[PDB]
Every structure is written in C-alpha cells, then in structure tokens.
C-alpha cells in the first residue's frame, strides 16, 4: 500500500506520461489536486495505450485507505492495488480489437462514420462543415494507421502503430540482454534460460540480485501504441491543418515508442548484479 | 556409420587442426597413410585442448568396420561414431587439474622436474646442457601460464590459459546473439528459448536456415586451452631459441583461439537469417 502512488506513476510511464503522483502527494497537495492529476494522467495514457476506449469517460481518484480507484463512465473498474494484470483484465471485456490490433469501436457513438480511405477532396468537405463526423481506420504514412473524429470544437487525430505488450517487452529485454559484458554473468543467464527462457532469465536475475520480489512490470500489460493530436477552433475545420496534424502525430508516436522502450530497458537493469 | 570422417575433421576443428581425413580417403590413400594422418592430427589436437595428458601415447586408427578408434597408451578410449561427448568422458578419468584448471601431471614424470620459478640463468643451463628436464607451471603475461620440458631431441614449450569448453561456447553464443539487429528474429529466438534455452533456440534457427547441422557441436566438449611450440635438433639446446619459442607459443595461443572462436561463431550463425 506504500507502493500504490509509485506503481501508478509507473503505469502512466508505460504510456510516456509523467504523472508525478508520488511527488504531488509527498508535497502535501490537497486531495482535489491529486484527483485532478490522477484523472488527467489516466486520460492522457488512454490516448497512447491503444485500447480503443475513446467513447468511455476515464477517471481516477484517491481512496481513504491509500489506494487509487480507476473508473470508466463513473463506474469502478479496478483499483491500483489489484495489480497491473487486473487492470488489463478489467478493460479487456470493454475492448474490441481487430486482427491488426486496431479498435473496432467508434469514438463518437452519435454520428456519421466515413470510410478511412476516402479521397482527401471528400474528407476536406467533412472537415470544413460544422457537424461532428468520424472516419474509420486506414493505413497511413510511415507504416502507421490513422483515423480522425470531431466532437464539437475539437478535432481528434489518432495515429497508431500497434504492438503487443509482450512484444514491446521482449524488445526492451533483448536490448538489455545484448549489452551484458561480464562473461560470468553471461554464463549465468545462459544456464537460467535453460529452465526459464531468455526473458525469465533476465527477470529472475533482477529479483535474485535485488534480494527481494521487485515490483512487477506494468509493461507486461501496457505499452505505447498510438498518439492523438488535437486541434481546436478554425484549425479543427481546416483540411491542411488536419494533414499537418497527421505528420505531427506520427512523429510524436515514434518518439514515445522510442523513449518508453529505452526507459523499460534501463529499468530492467535494476537488480542485475552485472559487473 | 558412413561420415565418421567428417566428424573427426570437425572434431579436429575445435583445436584448429585442419586435418583432411575426408579428402585423404576421397583420394583413396591406404590404411597406413590415413592412420598416420589420423594420429598426427590427434596428437596435434592434444597439444591445444589442454587435457594435460602429455604423458600418454595418443593414437587414432581405422577399425575393421569403417569406424575410427581413439586409443591412449594402447588401451582403446572411445570411437568416433560414439560421439564427441563420449570422447571427453573417456579422457575425464585420465585427467588431474588443479585449482586454476592447469594440469597436475608432469609431461615426463620420471624426470625430476624443476620449479616453475627457476631463474632463467639456471633454466639456460638445463637447456644448453645437458639432459631431459621439466618445469612446473608459472604465470606469464596475459593471464597465461607456461612451462617447458625436453625429451630426447625435442623441446616443448606450453603456454596455457584454461577455460571450460562450455564457458567458451557460452561466450561465443552470446557474441552472436548480441550481434542480431532484426526484431522479428530476436522475438523468434526469445520465444524459441522458452522451451529450448538460449543455446538451442540459436541452434534451432540453424537447422532451419542451414537445412542440416554441424555435428553435435564438438565445441560442446573441447576448446583451445593452450598451444605447444616445439623445437628440435640444435635449437632444442639453445636458450635464445627457447625464448623465441615461448613468444611464438604465446602469440599462437591467441591466434588459434581467435581462428577457432570465429569458426564456432559462424557455425552458430550457420542457419539463421539477418535479412
């Protein structure tokens, strides 16, 4: 229960979010301020994780016993103390991914959902008109996927590059593995993988070296998959602003997948005896 | 029971003995020729494997049934078709290795044998005049050890740096695994290692892209631990030559460790795809 703010910060980090809940709390921020930050973080994380739940309202808040409560549409879904896997299980029945790992739910709920591979001439007509609208997924520049919707005064541009948690973890672990120099430690990891796989060898070495059960990785369940760029006012009705926003969104995505993966690699060294 | 020749040659490989027990029967030389070539190669390998059995006659000869027999001092030891491992199990009881992995057998035995800290001046006396002599091990540059003995018209200089075969396999396996950039292949190896371990996953993606194999890695049992340099005739009574033989030995230990580790590494990338 003393790890709950830090566990949360750490869950937000998998999405490139710097929530700073443990810090906020230790500075004696009031509860309203902590709850507003829990919620803004969770919402930002939801735009990156690619679970496909733009149609739900996401909230989080402190409880008296020191826990953090995660809500969807004002209903409790999980508490941070139940663990990161549990939070993933609570979201799973709300999700509907296709085989590309893209959410099949709409973002709007009420409105028109256009084909994602429309002519720009036609998408321009949708963007310049007042009504809310929404576009379905399609491929996009740089081996991405993209869609867009508008809710009132804001245009939401989503770019995704799906990846499973497990695959993104394997990559960070590989990078750690590939850089070990101590020959004795190398030989230890070879043996361990006999029974445990390469992952598993690395994870067992962190626990053994730290002489404790280290905090489970929220990266086993969550990872950066997408970025949502936002536009407002006149710009949210301008087709060239939209096109510029797609490149922005794609560039930010690449950046988040880059540092979050490097940050997982550095955390994975925690506890390693190396030498 | 056919290609027992290819194994031998492959086994000689691990000691950088580039025998040709395949191309010598390909050109159809006689039972005596081959035997000469078989036993020569074996002796040469014993120079480098570092099993510390200088005090035995080592021999290999064709058997009636088209096999290859390894004998030690007249008593058969094992047969090639019986497999790399079984050779090492036969040598095991013949050995006696100290706390550093240096042999505890004298090379001559019935030759008094001088301390490894002999002053050169004194060693020089032994060399130039007169008879058989042996030195116990003593440290040398580069974490090596060294000793020297003469028997009859031939003087032997051994530079040795012990290391487990399995240690040297691990080391080479690691360098390969650390050289892989492809993420798909990396995720492949990881997943593959969940049942098969890091070795195996590597070997396994080898029967895939190599179609076949490189014989139960003889490197799994034998590696370069040493190099013997030899002098004969006048030079074997010259101290200035001895000194140069020591340097040669020392440099060759390095050279043969490199040319064999490369090989093992290329074997280890024998069936994988980096493209």
Swiss-Prot record, chains A, B:
- Extract the GO molecular function terms from the UniProt entry: damaged DNA binding; double-stranded DNA binding
Keywords assigned: DNA damage, DNA repair, DNA-binding, Phosphoprotein, Stress response
Q: What post-translational changes are documented for it?
A: Phosphorylated by RqkA in vitro. Phosphorylated primarily at Thr-63, and to a little extent at Ser-103 and Thr-135.
Q: How is its activity regulated?
A: Phosphorylation increases DNA binding affinity.
Null mutant phenotype: Cells lacking this gene show a reduced growth rate, do not exhibit a decrease in the efficiency of natural transformation, but are much more sensitive to ionizing radiation than the wild-type strain.
* Phosphothreonine modification, residue list: 63, 135
According to its UniProt entry, the protein is used in biotechnology as follows: The PprA protein combined with an immunofluorescence technique can be used to visualize radiation-induced DNA strand breaks in mammalian cultured cells, allowing the evaluation of DNA damage responses. This detection method could also be applicable to genotoxic tests in the environmental and pharmaceutical fields.
Q: What is the effect of changing residue 140 to E?
A: In KH311; loss of radiation resistance and DNA-binding ability
Phosphoserine: modified positions: 103
Q: Name one GO biological process term.
A: cellular response to desiccation
- Entry's induction text: Induced to high levels following extreme ionizing radiation exposure. Also highly induced in response to desiccation stress.
* Function (record text): dsDNA-binding protein that contributes to the ionizing radiation resistance of D.radiodurans. Plays a role in DNA repair and genome reconstitution, and is necessary for recovery from severe genomic fragmentation as a result of exposure to severe levels of ionizing radiation. In vitro, binds to double-stranded DNA carrying strand breaks and stimulates the DNA end-joining reaction catalyzed by DNA ligases. Thus, PprA plays a critical role in a non-homologous end-joining (NHEJ) pathway for the repair of radiation-induced DNA double-strands breaks.
Q: What is this protein called?
A: DNA repair protein PprA
